[PDB]
């Protein structure tokens, strides 16, 4: 089973930059009937993937000069000479040499901008929810950049992992920031066995984590 490793995972760029995405395979991508099947696909949000390069280096119809592909064996590279806004999205390589055929994990091309710390807001369970026998604690982490962030729930000084659902927005087309909601859900009874609830966010903009918490006691 051929593993395709794309790097970087995330590539921030300013419009007009040169950009390079790398794809390394775990086996030699050998020819079939004289054809080397290495292909690059771009997916923009809300759309089908679309072919950019096929047979390693060949631009597909309607694909601009700025896109080029190269490589052989186990090392392949897609290059964009000067990035436009229409190129922002996720890029996937694909190999059609060895069954079963495999995509890489994808590389997200995103717009660079000035760093921005998340606005963190934490919310105790609604009273109306406790009445139904459930309890969900909700943390919003809004308008940060870069995308890289860690979110950790703490209950009474203990990291908690079960019951946690996360969800994120893609890059905002107004201000180029990211946002995220984290939701720790427990039974009413488990929620009542404790008092201090904390959402902790580690991010580039702060040397020590950004913390928000409440005591159930107070609500």
């Amino acid at each position: 089973d051929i593993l395709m490793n794309q790097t970087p995972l995330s590539l921030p760029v300013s419009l007009g930059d040169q950009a390079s995405i790398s794809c390394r395979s775990s086996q030699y991508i050998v020819h079939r009937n004289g054809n080397t099947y290495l292909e690059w696909y771009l997916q923009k949000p809300g759309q089908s993937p679309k072919l950019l390069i096929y047979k390693v280096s060949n631009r597909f119809s309607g694909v601009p000069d700025r896109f080029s592909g190269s490589g052989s064996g186990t090392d392949f590279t897609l290059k964009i000479s000067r990035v436009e806004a229409e190129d922002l999205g996720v890029y996937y390589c694909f190999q059609g040499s060895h069954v079963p055929y495999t995509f890489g994990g994808g590389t997200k091309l995103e717009l660079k901008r000035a760093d921005a710390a998340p606005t963190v807001s934490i919310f105790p369970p609604s009273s109306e929810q406790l009445t139904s026998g459930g309890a969900s604690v909700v943390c919003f982490l809004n308008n940060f950049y870069p995308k890289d962030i860690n979110v950790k729930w703490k209950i009474d000084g203990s990291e908690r992992q079960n019951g946690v659902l996360n969800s994120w927005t893609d890059q905002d087309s107004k201000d180029s920031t990211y946002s995220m909601s984290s939701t720790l859900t427990l039974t009413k009874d488990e929620y009542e066995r404790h008092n201090s609830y904390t959402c902790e966010a580690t991010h580039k903009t702060s040397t020590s984590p950004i913390v928000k918490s409440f005591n159930r006691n107070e609500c």
């Binding site: 055929y101 919310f123 994120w168 927005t169 107070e218």
Partner: protein, 216 residues
């Protein structure tokens, strides 16, 4: 490439998608099938070759068949024993390309795997904690929990607070969808002036409004 199939299948059951091809002959070209799980990248499932034989991704080979009818230009994707994590967009496609013409993809077919009946959401208003600090801006929230199917529509003061809203993609757990919405307003506007979450769920024909009141 035109696709048809069910948007909704129940966990133990099967899934058939039809891909109707036009412009090329299935006697000449293979057709591939690919999918995309909600959080995830593209994944290759299988191929049916021009000569009629098939190859598959090893994680699926035991429960997936691709079949075709050369005369009616149909390709069929049949998969057994679906599970919640088989929820995805499924595409048919031409791949392993040798020339520009004939490299089409299908639109994609969204398939959702769930046991749940049509279920309206529980909507919960989220005021800040009693001790939370006040700055110029205050953030409020809405939790739309335990509904099925997608979509819901979340507005704040009937759309008037659009700027400053974040609505987050729903995530599917235990057969039901849950999503979150945050709005951020000047502290001079709340709690002085009323802020409300309006939630609509077309499938259950429910419309629910929920005032964000401080906890006393």
């Amino acid at each position: 490439l035109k696709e048809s199939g069910p948007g909704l299948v129940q966990p133990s059951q099967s899934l058939s998608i039809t891909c109707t091809v036009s412009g090329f002959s299935l006697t000449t070209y293979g057709v591939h099938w690919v999918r995309q799980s909600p959080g995830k990248g593209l994944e290759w499932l299988g191929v049916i070759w021009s000569g009629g034989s098939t190859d598959y991704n090893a994680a699926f080979i035991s429960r997936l068949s691709i079949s075709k009818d050369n005369s009616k230009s149909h390709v069929f994707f049949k998969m057994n024993s679906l599970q919640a994590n088989d929820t995805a967009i499924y595409y048919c496609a031409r791949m392993r390309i040798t020339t520009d013409w004939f490299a089409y993809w299908g639109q994609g077919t969204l398939v959702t795997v769930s046991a749940a009946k049509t279920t309206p959401p529980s909507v919960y208003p989220l005021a800040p904690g009693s001790a939370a600090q006040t700055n110029s801006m205050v953030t409020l929230g809405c939790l739309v929990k335990g509904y099925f199917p997608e979509p819901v529509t979340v507005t704040w003061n009937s759309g008037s607070l659009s700027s400053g809203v974040h609505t987050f993609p729903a995530v599917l757990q235990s057969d039901l969808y849950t999503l979150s919405s945050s709005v951020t307003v000047p502290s001079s506007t709340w709690p002085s002036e009323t802020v409300t979450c309006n939630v609509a769920h077309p499938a259950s024909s429910t419309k629910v409004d929920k005032k964000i009141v401080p906890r006393d």
